[PDB]
C-alpha cells in the first residue's frame with residue numbers, strides 16, 4: 068500500500084541486520100542484489116534481496132508483495148529458493164531469499180562441459196522433487212526452465228520464480244518451453260509444467276543446449292501442430308528420452324505426473 | 340537437329356517405356372540382345388522450352404565425358420534420332436537415400452550398414468572429384484539406391500548459381516541447408532564446399548533421413564551460419580563420425596578433409612564398425 072506495508076513479526080528483519088551488496092541483476096519488476104544478513108544470533112548469512120527499482124509503481128510494489136506472500140503460503144523446501152526474511156516497515160520493501168552462488172542451471176551446465184552421468188540425472192531428480200512440492204502446494208510455475216533453476220555452492224538445485232504474480236520477447240524464446248495446450252488453449256496446469264520439465268530435461272542432457280535454435284515463433288507453432296518433437300540428445304538413454312517424449316505427449320492426461328517422475332528418476336539415479 | 344552418336348544410340352524400338360518415376364519414367368531396354376534391363380529414361384515435358392533441351396543434352400554430354408563408376412548413376416545409352424530425346428540412365432529401384440533411410444527407421448539397418456553407406460557416397464564423390472566435377476547439391480535426396488543397396492550419386496552433371504532461389508523448398512526442405520557458407524554467401528563452389536554438403540549428408544545418414552534445421556527459415560539459417568552454428572551430434576553416432584561431420588563443416592574451406600581422405604577414413608571405420 069501507499070504509506071505503509073502490512074506488518075508481520077514472523078518474517079520481519081531489522082534493516083540494521085541486513086547489509087546490501089553487489090547487485091546480481093535486474094528486470095522489469097525490480098531488482099535483486101547480493102547482501103549479508105545477520106542472525107536470521109550474530110552470524111552473517113549471504114542472501115539475495117529482491118526490491119523495487121526507483122521507477123516502480125504502486126502495482127509493481129503490489130506484485131513484489133504478492134510474490135512474498137505467495138512464498139509464505141507455499142512454504143519451505145530444499146529444492147526451491149526459500150523466503151528468509153523481509154524489511155517491509157519504514158523504508159523500501161526487501162524480500163530476502165536464499166543465495167545461489169552458481170547461477171542458473173543453464174550457465175552452470177555450460178561452464179562444466181564436469182558433471183557425471185549420475186550428476187545429470189541427480190540434477191533432474193532435484194528439479195522434479197521441487198516441482199512435486201510446488202504442485203502439492205497448488206502452485207503452477209508456468210515458466211519452468213533451466214534459467215529459473217538456481218544452484219547453490221553445494222550444488223542444490225533450487226526452483227526460482229515459482230511465485231511470480233509477448234510470445235516474441237526473448238535470448239531464447241520462452242514459448243519454446245510451453246506446453247501446446249498452454250500455448251494454444253491458454254490452459255495452464257500442473258501437467259503443462261510437466262511438458263516444460265521435458266524441455267528442461269533435454270537442456271540437462273545437452274548441457275545448456277538451446278532448444279529449437281533459429282526457429283522463430285511462427286515456425287515453432289507449426290512444428291508443434293505437426294507433432295514434431297526434438298531429437299534424442301547424444302549421451303542420454305532411450306529411457307530418459309522416453310521420459311522427455313512422455314512429458315511431450317499431446318494429451319496432458321497421458322503425460323506423467325511430477326510424483327511419477329520423481330519416482331522414475333529416483334530409481335534411475337540409483338541405476339546409474 | 341540432334342547430332343547422332345554411334346557410341347550411345349539405342350533404337351527407339353528397343354526401349355519399352357513404362358511407369359513414370361516422378362520427367363523420368365521406368366522402362367525396359369531389350370538388348371543393350373534377347374535380354375531386357377530395367378532402366379530409367381529422362382525426357383522433356385510438353386511445355387519444355389528449347390533451353391530445357393539444351394540442359395538435357397548438356398547433362399548427357401557431361402555424363403558421356405565423366406566416365407563410369409560404381410557409385411554414380413551411369414549413362415546407359417540414348418534415343419536422339421527421329422523423335423524425343425531419351426537419356427537412358429541406370430535404374431535405382433529403392434529410391435533416394437532419404438526415403439531409403441526413413442522407410443527403415445524402427446517403430447532396420449545396422450551401424451556398419453550406415454557407415455558403409457557413407458563410404459559409398461564418398462567414393463561416388465571421390466570419382467566425380469577426380470574427374471573435375473563439382474556437384475553443388477550433394478544431399479541424400481541426390482543419392483539413389485539400387486536393388487543391391489548400392490549407393491549411386493545422381494544429378495552430378497546437371498546444368499545457374501546466380502539464378503538460384505533461396506526461398507524455394509524441395510518434401511518441403513531448403514537446399515540452402517546443404518550449402519557451405521562461402522557457396523551460400525560468396526557464391527564460390529568448389530570440391531571443398533561439396534565436402535561441407537557431404538557432412539550434412541553424413542548427418543542425414545545417422546539420423547535416418549533426418550531433416551536439417553527443422554523450422555529454420557532462410558533468414559534464420561544465414562544467422563546461424565554467420566554465428567558459426569553447427570548441428571548437434573545425432574544420437575546413436577560415434578564421436579569419431581561426429582568429428583568427421585564437424586571437420587566437413589570447417590569454417591575454413593582449405594581445412595576440410597578431401598573426399599580422398601574421407602574415403603580412407605570411412606573405409607577404416609567400416610572395417611572397425613559393428
Ligand SMILES: CCN(CC)CCCCNc1ncc2cc(-c3cc(OC)cc(OC)c3)c(NC(=O)NC(C)(C)C)nc2n1
Nearest residue numbers: 091092093099115117148162166167168169170227228229
Ligand atoms: C553471474 C555470476 N554467477 C556465476 C554463474 C553467479 C550468480 C549468482 C546468482 N545468485 C542468485 N542467488 C539467488 C537468487 C534468487 C533470486 C530470486 C529472488 C526472488 O525474490 C523474491 C525470488 C526468487 O524465487 C521465487 C528468486 C534471483 N532473482 C533474480 O531475478 N535474479 C536476476 C539476476 C535474474 C535479476 N536471483 C538470484 N541470484
Ligand SMILES: CCN(CC)CCCCNc1ncc2cc(-c3cc(OC)cc(OC)c3)c(NC(=O)NC(C)(C)C)nc2n1
Nearest residue numbers: 360361363379381412426428429430431432433434493494
Ligand atoms: C514407392 C517407392 N518408389 C516410387 C516408385 C521407388 C522409386 C524408385 C526411383 N527410381 C529411380 N531410378 C533411377 C533414377 C535415375 C534418375 C536420373 C535420371 C537422369 O537423367 C539423365 C540423371 C540422373 O543422374 C545422373 C538420374 C532419376 N531422376 C529424377 O530426377 N527422378 C525424379 C523422380 C526425382 C524426377 N530418377 C531415378 N529414379
